[PDB]
Design a protein around this ligand. Structure first.
Ligand SMILES: CCCCCCCCCCCCCCCCCC(=O)OC[C@H](CO[C@@H]1O[C@H](CO[C@H]2O[C@H](CO)[C@H](O)[C@H](O)[C@H]2O)[C@H](O)[C@H](O)[C@H]1O)OC(=O)CCCCCCCCCCCCCCCCC
Ligand code: CLA
Ligand code: CLA
Ligand code: CLA
Ligand code: CLA
Ligand code: CLA
Ligand SMILES: C=Cc1c(C)c2cc3nc(c4c5[nH]c(cc6nc(cc1[nH]2)C(C)=C6CC)c(C)c5C(=O)[C@@H]4C(=O)OC)[C@@H](CCC(=O)OC/C=C(\C)CCC[C@@H](C)CCC[C@@H](C)CCCC(C)C)[C@H]3C
Ligand SMILES: CCCCCCCCCCCCCCCC(=O)O[C@H](COC(=O)CCCCCCCCCCCC)CO[C@@H]1O[C@@H](CO)[C@H](O)[C@H](O)[C@@H]1O
Ligand SMILES: CC1=C(/C=C/C(C)=C\C=C/C(C)=C/C=C/C=C(C)/C=C/C=C(C)/C=C/C2=C(C)CCCC2(C)C)C(C)(C)CCC1
Ligand SMILES: CC1=C(/C=C/C(C)=C\C=C/C(C)=C/C=C/C=C(C)/C=C\C=C(C)\C=C\C2=C(C)CCCC2(C)C)C(C)(C)CCC1
Ligand SMILES: CC1=C(\C=C/C(C)=C\C=C/C(C)=C/C=C/C=C(C)/C=C/C=C(C)/C=C/C2=C(C)CCCC2(C)C)C(C)(C)CCC1
Ligand code: OEC
Ligand SMILES: [Fe+2]
Lengths: 82, 340, 62, 36, 34, 28, 447, 35, 335
């Protein structure tokens, strides 16, 4: 079939591709990295960090009990929880 | 015009087709890929299974999975802005949510994508049939990600959107639904499996009955993209299996069609079967046996011998698989043979 | 000997890493099949010799 | 752990085995430069 | 302009280096067992 | 410890022969 | 040979099957990676080898072989000379250069056609004699060391023999085997459980003893083919084409590799376990041994103990040989190793012996083998399918036996695709099926 | 001729290529989060 | 005639006998004829079998109480394991019966003649003069059947644990396995379920398109399928209008115009994955089981965080424990 949208080999092999990108690609690679390093990713998605999955003493699991006052639960767990 | 401008535009070629469909395919489908992805990389699934579900937590490819909502929610769509989460993208990310998301957004991606199969199809003067065949998965994905869960207790027991987390989905059935022994599921493997052969064979059967119509060691180029010329002697075909297997796929409209059927069909038989599992209607049963299983403590079929494996799969996993029940099984109650 | 050796062996490696990239480009670029021919015999005996050198050398430090 | 006098090279000894593979790899690099 | 193969191999090694990192990362990585 | 840097060189030893061959000529 | 007038890129090496190979050098080229690989891994192995840690406990596939030959071991499977191992890899490795240094040449700067330079035996496949004579060389070649080994076995140091009097220990094979009934007899031996035709081999006397017989037998072949031309039913029978030659030849490996995979999993003789892990059956027999002791030592009668099933826990009965360990362990009543043979009897395991002559050096070797068993995950967490991460160990036998099968399998796949394409030249329909002259579109319709 | 840099084709190829490296970097980062 | 065998020689190789019977034929043909005959009966009416190392007879004959699904002809007992238990080695016919000797017969037989069919799978591609990378497709299949009947047995030492010939039997051979090999977590089986799923998807794909760009030749009353005659010279489908569609439906270039390549892709995908799989079993045959990440994810204090694989493993123990209750007379299922 007749195809005509801006070619690929062109730019993957392009001089400009590598010059705009070289600098920006790792900008994302780095950006992601920082997202992890700051440790914000954790707070970003509640995702606990090894240091804080279980409180110190307790052995039970901080399980969400009631679907409607769930927000509380999480807290009261994340609460007593270190 | 005003419509046709939108049409005219979005409708013509431009490499990556984008159509009347795309409007829902692309968005839903995207989010969906993302939806699953973000979870595996950053989102935890602890507050629902006390189980780690993210690279970030340390999980690997085969470990990561985007949880599934605690048995406390049930089937509530668990909305980001709904009463449960209240647009708290961290809690909402915590109460699982992403699930209903990935699943619902996803559920459209399919609806949407199949449409696209129609759109591009009605625009190119072909038979939609491909779009039909595609029910094969919609039915599965519908039943297996919405219906079954919707039939059980909570979104929880629904698939897992994991690699291993999904393997759990198997066993758990074998162990509780003893699916393995359910006619419907059977045709489900009768079709997939049966079809795969059908595929691997037509593919190779074709390659060999290829007319040397090129020059040298590259029968891959010798083919004409341009015009009609049966590349594989249909005659050198039948007279082959007719003598090697006793049968001849004499015709190509049916051959290249019967291949459409095989799978799609079985899949449905699967989707039906599981529909059963939704309302716990399962094929564990097999009275004729079990009734005589009572007396004759010495008669044993694989069925029973197998059925027993199941009975172990329960007793051991239920306590940790179904955490919200706070099951407790003392050292004693656990079923075991003499030895381990 | 214990001191001399470590430079002797590490020589053999910088010579082989060399000897390697060498011949390859050599048989490839026949323009200097006539001159590089010797850049190929250079390492060679010095390489073989460098190995027989690590020779009596190893039976002397351990 | 190689003879004491080789202490310096545990690092290379470490890699040497990867090479074999490396060859099927290169075989491609060339085939690619030579447009198949 | 820039030769095509040269972009492939350097693009590739990255996948082979990044992927390699990931395997190491499973040994000391949080997900190790220590 | 060092192991990694020294592996690096050997690994890029092969594509370098391809490069040194691109510039000069032959092979073809 | 460029593209056109050749195959595609993936079938690259086919254009080397054209004219006279530009390079033997390819074959030599890698005939090096193969020898270099020993040079790296061997170095790498020792590079990680500790003398105390059981050789099989430290992923040693390569190193255990040197030991099995009598090098760097002696009393018990203990390693005294970290040197010998190092030696062999160092040599090979370096040895590889010459092998590669040359193959690398023969392929680019030498005669792009040795068909012409021919003279010296030379090149062309159909040439029925150049081939009979060639293999002929490589026949004297092999048998060559068959003796090389016999020497190491009889004139340079000996081998490791677990059976050997005292206990595992480097010993010299004094009296190899004469009698052809024995050395040959194995081939005629059962293939199934109880007697594997190749595998079953108690001692070295029959090994080195047999190798001898093979060196000469094999040399007598090179000497043979080198001098003559294959008969007419031979020509009549087998297709001759460079490819076709690989085709056969390749399916000798397939088979052979299985013969390895099936061998490295089963023998304690040529694979001592002091260097490899305890053989699969040995394991579930070792367990037996350990617990027969645990209770007997705890005060149980053992011999007369009625087991859960109806058979008996510690001791059971087999159909042909009367007495063996009982569990599910039975499957392996054919297992034989020095750690359990003393406690053997006329009728089988002896109650009197097992009860009082069962010494300590056994309870501890028995327990090592109970633990260290050929069970692990790719993850490399040695143990039952469902064990916690902690003790990890994968038997050399696991990797060895496993790999070779997948490869040897795959090869069998090869023997096919290379016979499938080669039996095709034989008539010329290999390129395809001629659009105007196909046998079928002109044949009596089956009905 | 002169084909734009802001192509339909491109918007897509991007929504992916941006995150991917954002993620890949995120992950290569985790590879060390001990303790 | 000079010799009468001359005719036997062309007959076997009769390129026109309704059903070709090559040289492999002459072995296949009956090896399966005996194999089948023993089978069909063993199912219909055969005594129980002590299978497991004990004397617990497992019944598997319709006439002995089997539904078609429960049906199965059972293996040889851990008593024999690998020894060759042919019909003569057994004293009373009934011995062979009880100790489960049909298995070996059925298994050994088909498992053999099967391969010859694989040979005679190609022998017709020679007498017929067609490219023959066909017989190989058939491998993957035969490999597995060989794997599940011959490798694994030699692997664990007894034909005892070789996928019992019967419906519910397989299910058994399976659930057990998972338990002792975590097969499901095995990289190989993956690449297996990979293709199978694929092929089963491609089988519906390539079958879909063709019929979707079928071409003209019918009414609405007529069966569109009728539009074609055996021995057509030009294919029935309009390939250009097909790729012209599918290609478009997401990417345009992730599509096939090269019919030879496509039909090929269909071959190799299923056939390659299936191989890995066939190898998967054959891999764990000597205990290189699937992955294992139990307790592999932990927090600071060491309190253990269950991996979604720990459940896999939980449900795994439930399996480990029960399977073959009574025999297992020791702590470790070392077989
Ligand atoms: C009798 C007629 C039978 C008809 C069958 C016809 C079917 C057609 C053939 C196809 C496959 C079936 C053939 C069976 C071959 C497999 C070997 C086997 O089963 O026999 C089992 C024996 C095992 O030997 C073991 O030998 C042991 C002895 O060792 C013990 O005792 C020794 C000293 O005696 C040592 O002390 C040692 O340490 C100790 O462990 C015991 O006696 C065991 O009971 C015994 O099992 O293996 C061996 O020796 C034999 C090794 C042969 C090489 C095979 C390679 C691997 C098999 C691959 C199959 C290829 C087919 C693939 C097709 C699909 C795609 C490829
Ligand atoms: C795996 C081992 C192997 C070997 C021994 C060969 C050998 C060969 N291939 Mg080949 N090939 C292979 C794998 C191999 N191939 C694979 C896996 C593929 C799939 C991509 C191919 C695809 C392929 C194609 C399409 C073709 C060949 C061809 C050839 C032949 C031409 C060689 C040449 O021109 O090199 C040229 C060499 C260069 C351009 C530079 C490479 C530098 C190498 C030789 C040196 C490296 C040595 C090492 C790095 C350091 C040692 C130095 C030493 C002095 C110490 C030669 C017989 C050609 C043929 O048809 O022959 C008649 C051909 O057209 N191959
Ligand atoms: C005869 C083939 C063979 C066998 C049986 C082994 C076996 C072993 N090797 Mg090994 N190795 C080999 C060839 C082999 N190697 C070669 C050619 C090299 C040079 C590159 C190495 C370099 C090497 C290193 C650096 C190390 C090992 C180690 C090991 C041990 C543990 C490895 C493991 O558990 O990961 C399992 C690995 C896999 C499951 C790879 C997955 C396979 C994928 C890629 C697909 C493969 C498909 C194909 C059919 C198989 C290819 C065959 C293989 C040669 C690649 C194990 C005994 C480790 C060890 O024990 O240290 C002392 C170790 O550190 N090897
Ligand atoms: C492995 C099997 C093998 C086989 C069958 C061959 C066969 C051949 N090689 Mg060869 N080669 C090999 C391995 C092999 N090679 C390896 C591993 C290398 C690495 C260097 C080489 C390097 C090499 C070179 C540079 C040349 C050959 C050549 C040849 C051809 C000349 C035959 C001749 O009369 O030599 C007979 C040789 C002997 C009987 C050995 C004599 C040993 C002493 C008495 C003197 C040898 C010189 C000295 C010892 C060191 C050699 C230096 C070197 C320049 C030769 C012949 C086809 C020549 C060729 O171009 O063929 C067309 C050629 O120029 N080869
Ligand atoms: C190393 C690789 C190799 C290769 C590729 C060959 C290839 C060949 N050799 Mg040969 N050979 C080799 C090594 C090799 N040889 C070695 C190392 C020796 C040492 C002697 C010989 C000695 C030798 C001799 C004396 C002869 C050959 C011959 C041949 C040719 C015919 C072989 C044939 O097709 O057998 C096909 C044979 C069969 C299929 C046998 C089928 C019949 C069965 C039933 C035998 C009956 C079994 C009996 C009861 C005993 C046990 C049976 C069973 C229970 C095990 C063929 C070109 C013949 C040739 O023409 O010139 C030499 C020949 O006369 N070779
Ligand atoms: C490239 C991948 C690869 C790697 C890393 C290995 C590695 C190994 N193989 Mg092996 N193998 C492979 C592919 C590989 N193999 C393939 C594709 C086949 C065909 C199916 C085989 C068939 C095979 C057999 C039959 C045996 C091995 C053995 C071995 C081990 C000893 C090496 C050896 O025998 O030295 C030099 C040779 C010996 C020490 C014994 C020679 C055996 C006699 C001479 C019969 C013929 C040898 C054999 C056919 C030649 C293959 C040698 C190998 C280096 C390729 C070693 C771990 C041996 C083993 O089990 O451990 C000791 C062994 O008996 N392999
Ligand atoms: C083995 C599982 C399986 C996979 C994963 C799979 C994948 C796919 N099948 C497709 C097509 C098809 N499959 C078909 C029949 C079948 N397909 C089958 C089985 C599969 N098919 C079986 C059951 C039948 C056999 C015939 C037909 C013939 C087609 C099509 O022609 C089509 C195709 O042309 O492929 C090339 C492609 C359509 C792409 C698409 O619609 O994206 C656009 C929109 C999507 C997919 C967004 C959906 C978002 C939803 C699903 C969210 C889900 C997120 C989680 C599931 C991700 C979790 C990841 C895990 C690791 C947990 C591709 C997605
Ligand atoms: C040969 C190729 C040919 C075709 C077949 C190839 C099959 C290859 C299979 C490999 C898949 C899994 C990779 C190993 C996992 C691993 O180990 O990497 C992990 C994340 O992986 C990953 O993130 C897997 C990446 C896959 C995501 C694909 C999403 C699809 C969208 C892509 C769009 C691109 C435009 C990171 O490590 C994990 O997380 C770490 C924490 O940082 C832990 O420490 C552990 O290491 C844990 O394993
Ligand atoms: C140091 C030393 C040495 C050297 C050596 C060598 C020679 C090495 C090598 C090397 C090499 C030489 C390696 C490798 C290779 C290769 C490469 C580096 C490649 C590549 C890459 C990539 C990444 C690619 C990619 C791709 C893609 C993308 C797809 C397909 C195609 C291709 C392949 C291109 C030795 C060892 C001898 C020892 C002594 C010293
Ligand atoms: C969720 C979310 C979202 C979105 C999202 C996203 C954005 C996602 C993402 C993303 C993505 C998009 C991701 C992904 C991807 C990718 C990647 C990152 C990949 C991967 C990886 C890997 C690792 C790979 C590997 C490989 C390959 C690639 C193939 C072959 C083999 C190998 C290995 C090479 C929304 C808005 C809806 C909402 C909010 C949140
Ligand atoms: C694949 C091929 C190729 C190439 C090549 C080949 C194939 C081969 C070979 C071979 C080779 C490539 C070889 C070699 C070599 C050499 C070596 C491998 C060496 C060495 C040495 C060493 C390694 C050493 C080191 C050391 C010493 C000296 C002593 C002490 C220790 C140390 C470590 C220091 C190509 C791609 C072009 C294509 C064609 C084929
Ligand atoms: Mn049928 Ca192999 Mn689990 Mn011990 Mn049994
Ligand atoms: Fe088709």
């Amino acid at each position: 079939g007749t195809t005509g949208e801006r070619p690929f080999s062109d730019i993957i092999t392009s001089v400009r591709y590598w010059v705009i990108h070289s600098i920006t690609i790792p900008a994302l690679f780095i950006a992601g990295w920082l997202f992890v390093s700051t440790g914000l990713a954790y707070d970003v998605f509640g995702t606990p960090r090894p240091d804080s999955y279980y409180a110190q003493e307790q052995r039970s699991i901080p399980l969400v009990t009631d679907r409607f006052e769930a927000k509380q639960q999480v807290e009261t767990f994340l609460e007593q929880l270190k | 015009g005003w419509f046709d401008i939108l049409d005219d535009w979005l409708k013509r070629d431009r490499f990556v087709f984008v159509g009347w469909s795309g409007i829902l395919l692309f968005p839903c489908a995207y989010l969906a890929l993302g939806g699953w992805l973000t979870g595996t990389t950053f989102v935890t699934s602890w507050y629902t299974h006390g189980l780690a579900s993210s690279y970030l937590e340390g999980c690997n490819f085969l470990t990561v999975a985007v949880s599934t909502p605690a048995n406390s929610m049930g089937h509530s769509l668990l909305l980001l802005w709904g009463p449960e989460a209240q647009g708290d993208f961290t809690r909402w990310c915590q109460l699982g949510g992403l699930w209903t998301f990935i699943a619902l957004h996803g559920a459209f991606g399919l609806i949407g994508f199949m449409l696209r199969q129609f759109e591009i199809a009605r625009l190119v003067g072909v038979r939609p049939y491909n779009a039909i065949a595609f029910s094969a998965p919609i039915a599965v994905f519908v039943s297996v990600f919405l219906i079954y869960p919707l039939g059980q207790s909570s979104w929880f027991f629904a698939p897992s959107f994991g690699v291993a987390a999904i393997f759990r989905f198997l066993l758990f059935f074998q162990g509780f639904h003893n699916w393995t022994l359910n006619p419907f599921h059977m045709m489900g493997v009768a079709g997939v499996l049966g079809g795969a052969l059908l595929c691997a064979i037509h593919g190779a059967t074709v390659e060999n009955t290829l007319f040397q119509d090129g020059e040298g060691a590259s029968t891959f180029r010798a083919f004409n993209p341009t015009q009609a010329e049966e590349t594989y002697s249909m005659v050198t075909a039948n007279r082959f299996w007719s003598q090697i297997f006793g049968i001849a796929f004499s015709n190509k409209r049916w051959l290249h069609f019967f291949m459409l059927f095989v799978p799609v069909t079985g899949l449905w038989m699967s989707a039906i079967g599981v529909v059963g599992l939704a309302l716990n209607l399962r094929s564990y049963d097999f009275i004729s046996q079990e009734i005589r299983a009572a007396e004759d403590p010495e008669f044993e079929t694989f069925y029973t011998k197998n059925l027993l494996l199941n009975e172990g799969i329960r007793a051991w996993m239920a306590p940790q698989d179904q955490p919200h029940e706070n099951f407790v099984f003392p050292e004693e109650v656990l079923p075991r043979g003499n030895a381990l | 000997m214990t001191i001399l050796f470590q430079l002797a062996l590490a020589a053999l490696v910088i010579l082989s890493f060399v000897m390697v990239i060498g011949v390859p480009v050599a048989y490839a670029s026949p323009q200097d099949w006539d001159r590089s021919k010797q850049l190929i015999f250079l390492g060679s005996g010095l390489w073989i010799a460098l190995v027989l050198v690590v020779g009596v050398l190893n039976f002397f430090v351990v | 752990k190689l003879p004491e006098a080789y202490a310096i090279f545990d690092p290379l000894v470490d890699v040497l085995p990867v090479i074999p593979v490396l060859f099927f790899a290169l075989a491609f690099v060339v085939q690619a430069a030579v447009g198949f | 302009r820039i030769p095509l193969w040269i972009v492939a191999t350097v693009a590739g090694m990255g996948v082979i280096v990044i992927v390699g990192l990931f395997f190491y990362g499973a040994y000391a990585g949080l997900g190790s067992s220590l | 410890i060092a192991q990694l840097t020294m592996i690096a060189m050997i690994g890029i030893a092969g594509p370098m022969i391809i490069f040194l061959l691109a510039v000069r000529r032959g092979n073809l | 040979d460029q593209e056109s007038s050749g195959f595609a890129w993936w079938a690259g090496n086919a254009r080397l099957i054209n004219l006279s190979g530009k390079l033997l050098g390819a074959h030599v080229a890698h005939a090096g990676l193969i020898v270099f690989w020993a040079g790296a891994m061997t170095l790498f192995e020792l590079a990680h080898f500790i003398p105390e840690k059981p050789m099989y406990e430290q992923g040693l596939i390569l190193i255990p072989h040197i030991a099995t030959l009598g090098w760097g071991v002696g009393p018990g499977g203990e390693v005294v000379d970290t040197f010998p191992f190092f030696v062999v890899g160092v040599v090979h490795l370096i040895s590889s250069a010459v092998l590669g240094f040359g193959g690398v040449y023969h392929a680019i700067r030498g005669p792009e056609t040795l068909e012409e330079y021919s003279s010296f035996f030379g090149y062309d496949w159909k040439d029925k004699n150049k081939m009979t004579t060639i293999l002929g060389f490589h026949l004297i070649v092999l048998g060559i060391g068959a003796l090389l080994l016999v020497a190491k076995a009889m004139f340079f140091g000996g081998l490791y023999d677990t059976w050997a009097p005292g206990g595992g220990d480097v010993r010299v094979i004094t009296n190899p085997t004469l009698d052809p009934r024995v050395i040959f007899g194995y081939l005629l031996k059962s293939p199934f459980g109880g007697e594997g035709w190749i595998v079953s081999v108690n001692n070295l006397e029959d090994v080195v003893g047999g190798h001898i017989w093979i060196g000469l037998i094999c040399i007598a072949g090179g000497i043979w083919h080198i001098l003559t031309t294959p008969f007419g039913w031979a020509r009549r029978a087998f297709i001759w084409s460079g490819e076709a030659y690989l085709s056969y030849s390749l399916g000798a490996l397939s088979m052979m590799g299985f013969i390895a995979t099936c061998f490295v999993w089963f023998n304690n003789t040529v694979y001592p376990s002091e260097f490899y892990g305890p053989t699969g059956p040995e394991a579930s027999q070792a367990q037996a041994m350990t617990f027969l002791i645990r209770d007997q030592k705890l005060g149980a009668n053992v011999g007369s103990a009625q087991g859960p099933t109806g058979l008996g826990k510690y001791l059971m009965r087999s159909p042909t040989g009367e007495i063996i360990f009982g569990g599910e362990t039975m499957r392996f009543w054919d297992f034989r190793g020095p750690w359990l043979e003393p406690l053997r009897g006329p009728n089988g395991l002896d109650l009197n012996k097992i009860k009082n002559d069962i010494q300590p050096w056994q309870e501890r070797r028995a327990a090592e083998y109970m633990t260290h068993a050929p069970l692990g995950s790719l993850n490399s967490v040695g143990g039952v399918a469902t064990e916690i991460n902690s003790v990890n160990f994968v038997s050399p036998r696991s990797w060895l036996a496993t790999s070779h099968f997948v490869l040897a399998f795959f090869f069998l796949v090869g023997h096919l695709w290379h016979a499938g394409r080669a039996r095709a030249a034989a008539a010329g329909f290999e390129k395809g099926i001629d659009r105007e002259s196909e046998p079928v579109l002109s044949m009596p319709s089956l009905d | 001729v002169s084909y734009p840099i802001f192509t339909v084709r491109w918007v897509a190829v991007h929504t992916l290529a941006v995150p991917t490296i954002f993620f890949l970097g995120a992950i290569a980062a985790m590879q060390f989060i001990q303790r | 005639s000079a010799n009468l065998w001359e005719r036997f020689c062309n007959w076997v190789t009769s390129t026109d006998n309704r059903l070709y019977v090559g040289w492999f034929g002459v072995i296949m043909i009956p090896t399966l004829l005996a194999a089948t005959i023993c089978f069909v009966i063993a199912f219909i009416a055969a005594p129980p079998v002590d299978i497991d190392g004990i004397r617990e007879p497992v019944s598997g004959s319709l006439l002995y109480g089997n539904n078609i699904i429960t049906g199965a002809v059972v293996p040889s007992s851990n008593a024999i394991g690998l020894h060759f238990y042919p019909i003569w080695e057994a004293a009373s016919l009934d011995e062979w019966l009880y100790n489960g000797g049909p298995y070996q017969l059925i298994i050994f037989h088909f498992l053999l003649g099967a391969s010859c069919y694989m040979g005679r799978q190609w022998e017709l591609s020679y007498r017929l003069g067609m490219r023959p990378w066909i017989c190989v497709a058939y491998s993957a299949p035969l490999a597995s059947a060989f794997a599940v009947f011959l490798i694994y047995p030699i692997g664990q030492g007894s034909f005892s644990d070789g996928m019992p010939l019967g419906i519910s039997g397989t299910f058994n051979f399976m659930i057990v396995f998972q338990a002792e090999h975590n097969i499901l977590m095995h990289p190989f089986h993956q690449l297996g379920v990979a293709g199978v799923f694929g092929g089963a998807l491609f089988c519906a794909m390539h079958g879909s398109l063709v019929t979707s760009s079928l071409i003209r030749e019918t009414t609405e009353t007529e069966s569109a399928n009728y539009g074609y005659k055996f021995g057509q010279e030009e294919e029935t489908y309009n390939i250009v209008a097909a790729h012209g569609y599918f290609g478009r439906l997401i990417f345009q270039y992730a599509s096939f115009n090269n019919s030879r390549s496509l039909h090929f892709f269909l071959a190799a995908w299923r056939v390659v994955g299936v191989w890995f799989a066939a190898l998967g079993i054959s891999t764990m045959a000597f205990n290189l089981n699937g992955f294992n990440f139990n307790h592999s994810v932990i927090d600071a204090k060491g309190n253990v965080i269950n991996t979604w694989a720990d459940i896999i493993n939980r449900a795994n123990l439930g399996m480990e424990v029960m399977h073959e209750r009574n025999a297992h007379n020791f702590p470790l299922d070392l077989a």
